[PDB]
Symmetry: C5
Subunit: 205 residues, 5 copies
Amino acid sequence: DKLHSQANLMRLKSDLFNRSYPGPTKDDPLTVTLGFTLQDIVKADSSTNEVDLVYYEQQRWKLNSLMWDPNEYGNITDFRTSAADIWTPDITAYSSTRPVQVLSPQIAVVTHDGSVMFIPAQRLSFMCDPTGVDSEEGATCAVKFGSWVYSGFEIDLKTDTDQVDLSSYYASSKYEILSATQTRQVQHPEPYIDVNLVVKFRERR
Amino acid sequence: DYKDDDDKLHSQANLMRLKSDLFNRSYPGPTKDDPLTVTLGFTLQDIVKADSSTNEVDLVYYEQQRWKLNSLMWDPNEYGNITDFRTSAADIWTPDITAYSSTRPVQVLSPQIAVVTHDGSVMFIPAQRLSFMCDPTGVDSEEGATCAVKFGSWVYSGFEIDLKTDTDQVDLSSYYASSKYEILSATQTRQVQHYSCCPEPYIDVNLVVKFRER
Amino acid sequence: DDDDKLHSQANLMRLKSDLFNRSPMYPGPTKDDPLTVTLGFTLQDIVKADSSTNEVDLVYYEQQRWKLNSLMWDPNEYGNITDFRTSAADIWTPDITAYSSTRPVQVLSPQIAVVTHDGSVMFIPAQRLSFMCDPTGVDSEEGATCAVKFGSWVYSGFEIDLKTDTDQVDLSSYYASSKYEILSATQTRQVQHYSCCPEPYIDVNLVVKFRERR
Amino acid sequence: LHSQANLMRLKSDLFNRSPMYPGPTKDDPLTVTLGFTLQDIVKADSSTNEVDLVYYEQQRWKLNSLMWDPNEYGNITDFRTSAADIWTPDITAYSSTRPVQVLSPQIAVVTHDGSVMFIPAQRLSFMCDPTGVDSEEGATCAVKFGSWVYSGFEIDLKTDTDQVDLSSYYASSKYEILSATQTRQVQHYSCCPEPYIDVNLVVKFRERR
Amino acid sequence: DDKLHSQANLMRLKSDLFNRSPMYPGPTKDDPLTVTLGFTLQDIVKADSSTNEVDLVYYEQQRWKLNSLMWDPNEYGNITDFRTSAADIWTPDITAYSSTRPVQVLSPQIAVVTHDGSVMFIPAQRLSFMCDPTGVDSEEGATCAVKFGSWVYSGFEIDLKTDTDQVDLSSYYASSKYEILSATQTRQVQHYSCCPEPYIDVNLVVKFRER
Ligand SMILES: *[C@@H]1O[C@H](CO)[C@@H](O[C@@H]2O[C@H](CO)[C@@H](O[C@@H]3O[C@H](CO[C@H]4O[C@H](CO)[C@@H](O)[C@H](O)[C@@H]4O)[C@@H](O)[C@H](O[C@H]4O[C@H](CO)[C@@H](O)[C@H](O)[C@@H]4O)[C@@H]3O)[C@H](O)[C@H]2NC(C)=O)[C@H](O)[C@H]1NC(C)=O
Ligand SMILES: COc1cc(O)ccc1/C=C1\CCCN=C1c1cccnc1
Ligand SMILES: COc1cc(O)ccc1/C=C1\CCCN=C1c1cccnc1
Ligand SMILES: COc1cc(O)ccc1/C=C1\CCCN=C1c1cccnc1
Ligand SMILES: COc1cc(O)ccc1/C=C1\CCCN=C1c1cccnc1
Ligand SMILES: COc1cc(O)ccc1/C=C1\CCCN=C1c1cccnc1
Ligand SMILES: *[C@@H]1O[C@H](CO)[C@@H](O)[C@H](O)[C@H]1NC(C)=O
């Protein structure tokens, strides 16, 4: 049975990858859903106006080409694969000051409806003036995320909620979160889309 | 003699043939219909740094991982009584066990080579330096600071990867005697948790270390 | 229309295969077949100015544009595809280098180019660069001035020529709360004669005048 | 041209026409000789109890599968090749605190008797309390090196001398070397019956005056 | 058409040299190689008196010649030279002997090959090396030195030479924290008591002081 279930999974992976994606186009556009889980504000450097965040970046999209019928593959409804084995979106912070550091494996989960969920943990340094962090009102910084090379005609971006997930925020961080929002923005001949991460924070008093 | 020389060549041939049969002739990872149990254990070697400016602590440890696969089994009698072999971890599937609250990418300090035994068991023990979220307030006190970090599969839920420990006591037999920090206690405990992100329970091992300035 | 989508992917896959697999990699420019690369900078931030080492760290987007006959197609042969995105590793890219960096440049963005059916390519890497700069005067009204040349490392002006669209650096994305304010930022094509080499190299000289924000 | 052809033929014969060496085993064990040449103690950090060393690590071993008759190859007696082209031992510091950094090319010299000499230059941070370094008596630290995954029944270790080579130690280092030894140790765990082998590098050092 | 034939000729040349020959196995006693080395010092970035490490930025010019890289330009549309990734060809294992961190490469690594088989390769590098900067804040300044040479080849396999013993200072950064008093690059033949073979290095000696 286990031999058969393994064989089924190997067969599924082969048919989807080997017996056949060039990325989205205006004729075949994709929607990427983005969500942040903020874990920690590690450092806020007033000498350079750089702040360092650690977060999980949840990315989800769906491809017709990743759809299968579970009945054809021993009731398998999902599988895991290295993110290097599939196309992934070029979602980038627009105002980072150092290359993003990847903290987790980079493995995606593919479901039989064609949906892909990819949640890399990252540490990001970005442009931020932390003046006011030691006051009741705190400091506010923001950073936009979006595709580097695809317009809104090829990749639409969206959020499921504008409330950043703070359920995993480190309780003993040097900084307390007053608010954290993630808001889709459209800028205008093709539309350009980003998600603006806005964090208000202050010294844990 | 020549016989002994031949026996060495045969031994090499048998090992090359075993590795070929296991890897070349014939694992896509665990599934709900074939879940895998990974045993984890930590050997803490040193608390290198406890940074109160950022609430990051840096640990050096060996992370022992064990699992067993039917697909790595062989009969030693078919292979010159070979009972185990060493192979680059890149040659086999390995679990995606990750710290949940690191603050910098984990750094690997050792070769990444696994030992595979004829019963299909694998043992893999990478040495790592990890920076993780920890408030070291109280490190300059009798009772010390207490920090914790969860380790588990990144992408497999408890439907596919289960974890276990052999003991809840961290191996402190190799702890650096002249570290800046002395260890008061170090435990490793399996936990089953749900996250609002996702409907399936994930398993982790929670490493909890209580330490103070020496 | 799910089939029109399938047809559009097939057409793009076929185009890329034709340009990349059923055609051999462009060997780079030569004196018989020189290339003009258009360069433009968008300065985002002066992050750090180190007076102990005389190094300054910039974050910028470097726009590169060139055109190759070998990347041309007829859109009518490929379902009216007029352009596509592809990893910059799939195509030749120019070896444009800062001539006075003090650390390897760090890439901040995906390295993906846009190729258009007339054979034109646009590639816009975001970078952090440390370069040689004495920031003396940064704490004064007149500020500090530093300069850095960008150009091909190995191709002379007989092989790679450069041009700009304007000599004004794009400051429309400069971080408003930077520690440093920009007084001026220019980008100027130069023909550079080096005593080592009989052929001159073309560069774009980026000159930035800046001061500590008030 | 014939000398070049002879060498290309030798390498092809050794690397293409004859099987892989799969590493040592209980039935085909290997002796690895280790020696250190200490070049500099760069940094001794008393805030973290880490010391940084720069050294050359000489490794030697011999394989029947790397032997040839020079007479068959225009009297070539040795050659140099990328260490990636051949099996190399997984010799590791046991108490490093950062990944070792390689400072040189990693190229092995193979001799016709099957012996291999591989001498990477390395910078290593390791666990060390430098207390006493600002005293006449100095500080003492130690680090063990050995195979990560092979027991003494698969890889034995040996030194040619127990004196660390100090002939290349940097004359204007912040630290002077009082002594440096490299000593083979055999330990037996309760886990297992086979012996486990390391070479313990012990350095006594003090701030230069 | 002229340009298509020129590209075709170049693609054919590279194919013939690389794709269609057995890889050059490096020099030997019977087929020794001369490598010419020269340095262009661009900046002393940092001089650390707490660890006695100094950081230099320099261009390292390397030139050698291989018969296996020769061609008759008449057979290839009169192409006389080309540029190629340094990873496409053998390069000499020239290394600093007293670095303290891995050298960092600042430029592309692309070589120029000429029809006579000569190769020119000039990587820009940042190097940290062992240096006591005592005296840097004095009129006499400090003096440091670092040897460069093959890691594994003797003087009977790789000879090193310089064209000049004067380091190229023409591109030295005029506003560096440190000014250069002198910089020389001297070929040295070293013997080791083990072995009768000569071993060759180029000793880079820099005298410098705070500007
Ligand atoms: C690769 O390396 C091998 C090993 O060195 C070379 O083989 C040797 O080649 C030399 C040169 O031809 C030979 O030297 C000659 O030896 C003769 C004696 O031969 C017998 O005794 C020797 C020594 O015990 C035995 O090893 C050998 O098997 C024989 O039993 C001498 O009579 C010769 O002297 C005369 O010739 C020289 C010039 O060559 C004159 O100057 C002298 O004055 C005199 O007239 C000579 O010394 C040697 O025998 C070979 N040794 C072996 C083991 O074969 C290869 O030639 C070398 N290169 C190549 C391409 O193979
Ligand atoms: C030269 O590049 C720019 C200058 C500006 O002043 C503003 C935006 C961009 C490009 C951007 C912005 C962020 C999304 N990515 C790009 C981009 C655009 C085209 C190709 N590659 C990248
Ligand atoms: C966006 O993801 C999360 C938000 C939370 O608030 C808490 C946990 C996770 C996911 C985790 C926890 C770490 C181990 N695995 C995951 C995960 C789950 C699914 C896919 N990839 C990663
Ligand atoms: C030895 O090389 C140099 C010495 C100098 O004093 C100044 C400049 C260069 C090279 C340069 C400068 C322009 C960019 N490219 C080169 C170059 C020249 C030849 C080969 N590779 C790189
Ligand atoms: C969990 O591993 C250990 C705990 C201890 O308390 C002591 C030693 C080791 C293993 C070591 C020590 C260093 C050499 N290699 C190993 C090892 C042993 C087996 C497999 N992989 C690595
Ligand atoms: C352990 O090796 C040495 C000890 C010393 O005290 C001095 C020199 C060397 C080797 C050197 C010198 C630097 C260049 N390369 C070698 C070398 C020699 C043999 C194999 N690999 C490297
Ligand atoms: C190259 O030069 C030679 C002689 O100078 C000439 O005969 C030949 O036709 C020229 N062109 C080509 C493409 O070989």
